[PDB]
């Protein structure tokens, strides 16, 4: 019944948002941009979205009128535009979609590509990693400057990037024998299975309680320190890892000499694991996903980590 | 009971071979290399394989003994090494895998990364695209010099790359109004759904009738000229396309000025659509997959194209 267009449909979180939308019963449309020519994996993703009942909608960010038509077909727009330097970081491209929405005037709600650290709260962050927050704030201000009703989904680390690897930067698998603990390891971090983030997204986009609101993904059982997450892994394996504590001064040493994308990752990690930006402020139950949607039975970090045994 | 090691598990056809091996009931092992630590999509394929019952085996082509130890665990090795210029063309890396298979001595059969044009018949092929057939023949010669038992799966155009686009290059979708036709369009081409290719592969690797044989994938109902292919789409859509014929001399014009991966593609199309190298020779029923495995209800091109509607 609610019509939803997903932009960034074949992206990491986007393809999950698409599926979650179909599973929730939204009439679901996905923007197929024509610039994806020989990218066979994207094409076949679109093919499989259609098999499950998504509706292809052709459009391009180089064709302002195509964006206008596209968003004219739906009540809700969800953007999953890319925003990670080691992949690509085109948050600002959404500006064109905001103004398409402005001109079209039918969109009851817009969800921009947030799904992470809360932008309004990273004003102190260090470049280059800060470009993320600023660009999202740039889009937030364009949304509000056009009066577009909105929901911002913030709050949780993607489990695949921060849990499955015990928060080590070199990899996405657990370490064999040795692990680095950032600082004392006693700073709470919020972890969420990406399928849960998508599930909450699909449940909130037409929840009246989240209209013009920031929704936090902070499921209580998944608020864990890094030493706590490493300890779940040690339990699951019955083996203790050699832990080296890394001080902030050492984690940042010679950052100036590193490639810009890695500097940005280091900056993001710094804010999460040394400053604790995801848990350094409180949020009530009228703005937290697992409390707004208690039937969602979110995966806990131990079952997430069990897949890696 | 047949234990297969798939090298190239996450590749385009490789991941399809992984799942076909599982569905066929082979005890299925997949080589997970440590170099792919930060490619999220590959890491999560390995997880998805695991959940299906595949067995993870760690090994690197930069660690000869890891390869030896890898191939020691299985009866059959299937290689799906990359070999397309606009993706990756590393056929010759298999030579190290061949060395390992030689040293290990237990392997009952090897399937090298073939799955296309039949290399020994591409003697007179145009550079740079000729690179593909020369590297596969250099690999073939190491397999036989080393007395390794083999099966070569050849003969079919991947349907995604030649059928879902009506054989239009540099796109993967059917054109909306106009189609180019190479020559008169009456040269017979062989098309196969890549899942049928993987299923035949999984079925042939423990088939006594195909030990040390070339196996052609030439499903008779999918032996089509390009015009017949185009006419199937026209009947699905109910819309006639405006057809422009393109002579060999204009298709090949100024080839030397092309990005050399496009030179490789041009040459490959030329051999397929202009010289009919996939249909210029007959093959017996004792060496053709649909005839060896009639229980496989292979997808025809009308059922294939219904996905693009
Ligand atoms: N731990 C956390 O909390 C994390 C948060 N995030 C955030 O998730 C959001 C999405 O991240 P992620 O899923 O990796 O993004 P992706 O790299 O996966 O890209 C998503 C989509 O962006 C579209 N895209 C990329 N470039 C362009 C372009 N020039 N023009 C139009 N469309 C483009 C593409 O859409 P199309 O499908 O049309 O091709 C692509 O599929 C980001 O804000 C990111 O910061 C992501 C990582 C972790
Ligand atoms: N119409 C036709 O007949 C077609 C035929 N083909 C043929 O199919 C075969 C597979 O092609 P395709 O599926 O596109 O292959 P891909 O390009 O998708 O790559 C397959 C695998 O090759 C592995 N790989 C790549 N580089 C290396 C490397 N340096 N060292 C070790 N492993 C590497 C990777 O394995 P890993 O997953 O472990 O990381 C990769 O996943 C090729 O011979 C191709 O020539 C391909 C296109 C069309
Ligand atoms: C938790 O908030 C965010 C998370 C990220 C995800 O941390 C920045 C990124 C990212 C995932 O890719 C993370 C990252 C960057 C560099 C790395 O080496 C890395 O290794 C796992 C992981 C992106 C933006 C955010 O606001
Ligand atoms: C059919 O046998 C083969 C086909 C190929 C096909 O053509 C080169 C590739 C593989 C897939 O990609 C085809 C391709 C090349 C260039 C293009 O522009 C293209 O557009 C669809 C498609 C490669 C090796 C083969 O043995």
Residue numbers in the entry:
A (entry chain E), B (entry chain F): 9 to 317
Task: Kindly provide excerpts from the paper associated with this entry.
Pinoresinol/lariciresinol reductase (PLR), an NADPH-dependent reductase, converts pinoresinol to lariciresinol and subsequently to secoisolariciresinol. Here, we present crystal structures of IiPLR1 from Isatis indigotica and pinoresinol reductases (PrRs) AtPrR1 and AtPrR2 from Arabidopsis thaliana, in the apo, substrate-bound and product-bound states. We found that, for all 16 structures we solved, each enzyme adopts a similar head-to-tail dimer conformation, strongly suggesting that each PLR/PrR functions as a homodimer, consistent with the literature that TpPLR1 exists as a dimeric entity in solution. Each structure contains a head-to-tail homodimer, and the catalytic pocket comprises structural elements from both monomers. β4 loop covers the top of the pocket, and residue 98 from the loop governs catalytic specificity.
In contrast to IiPLR1_NAP_ + PIN, the β4 loops of AtPrR1_NAP_ + PIN and AtPrR2_NAP_ + PIN can be clearly identified. These well-defined loops twist as an “8” shape and cover both the NADP+-binding and substrate-binding grooves. Within the twisted loop, His93 and His97 “grasp” helices α5 and α10, while Val92 and Phe94 interact directly with (+)-pinoresinol; Arg95 strongly interacts with NADP+ as well as each of the GXXGXXG motif and α2-helix from neighboring protomer of the dimer. Similar β4 loops are also observed in all other AtPrR1 substrate/product-bound structures, whereas each β4 loop is disordered in the corresponding IiPLR1 structures, which indicates that the β4 loop may participate in substrate selectivity and, hence, catalysis. Furthermore, Leu46 (corresponding to Val46 in IiPLR1), His276 and Phe277 of AtPrR1 are positioned similar to the corresponding residues of IiPLR1 to effect substrate binding or product release, except that the β4 loops cover the substrate/product, which are disordered in the IiPLR1 structures. Besides the β4 loop, Val46 in IiPLR1 is replaced with Leu46 in AtPrR1, which has the effect of compressing the substrate-binding pocket.
